[PDB]
Subunit: 112 residues, 3 copies
Amino acid sequence: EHNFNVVINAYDTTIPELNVEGVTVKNIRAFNVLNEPETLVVKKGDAVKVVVENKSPISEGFSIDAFGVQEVIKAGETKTISFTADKAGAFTIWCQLHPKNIHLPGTLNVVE
Amino acid sequence: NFNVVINAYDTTIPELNVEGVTVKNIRAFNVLNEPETLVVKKGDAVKVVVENKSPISEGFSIDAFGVQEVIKAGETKTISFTADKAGAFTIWCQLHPKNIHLPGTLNVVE
Amino acid sequence: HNFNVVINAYDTTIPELNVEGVTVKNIRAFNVLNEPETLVVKKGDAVKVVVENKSPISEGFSIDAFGVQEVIKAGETKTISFTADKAGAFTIWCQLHPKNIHLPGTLNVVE
Ligand SMILES: [Cu+2]
Ligand SMILES: [Cu+2]
Ligand SMILES: [Cu+2]
């Protein structure tokens, strides 16, 4: 395990009624695509390798502007994304294909 | 020693105007771990005090280190394990949909 | 040394999503996101966070552990700074809106 494993999953949740242990919640409807895990932490200078498996039914994106990373993983495909974390800081990991509050963003933290 | 509070949010806002900006038909139910992210160095022992403020029992799991607990509503449970592996691991609830009780991350840095 | 966090509002409504043969219906989600959500520093570090608010309304940026309770006017930028003198994981949240609308983040102070 010299690299990170990230699974992109789609979640289609429709629960018009939920009563658990006597507590009730109504009209729940949320659709989202998640990166699991969302956060990747590395040291400055580290050679980063992220094996992204897209389990979403559609093509998904993986982007980190700071390091020119911008990929599109086909549905069911697995792509290894590699780059060198030559800059310290916090950088958003996002999908350039869907609304950010649908396919929620993650973070790449490069510590000193 | 970490402190994570699990909170549930039942938000419903058909319409609301603030600073001249109108938002409509907002309906969202979610359970969240606060904080969501935990960062440790490889090899050190981890003690996570999880306080569940959700009205129902919640889950806290991290497969890589065989962690998986069910915390009753209003209860507090101390999770302890050793981060003997470096990487990024999903902290999730095994009881509810992933996009309802949003996942977090345990990062084990070398 | 100076992080860059951008707060964005998203008003998403998709009656019917149709892409590559997949169909999802009645999608509606309104959220405010801090981008990036996670900040990792070392104990004792002087932290500076340039918070740019792209939200059409006032937004909050708070970190209880370090007495950070700030409000950023719509479309304005504010530099928040403090010393991370305690190790741990601390919630970065908005004190103005519901936690599940304006999703929380984390400030991680490692030894
Ligand atoms: Cu996406
Ligand atoms: Cu849960
Ligand atoms: Cu807010």
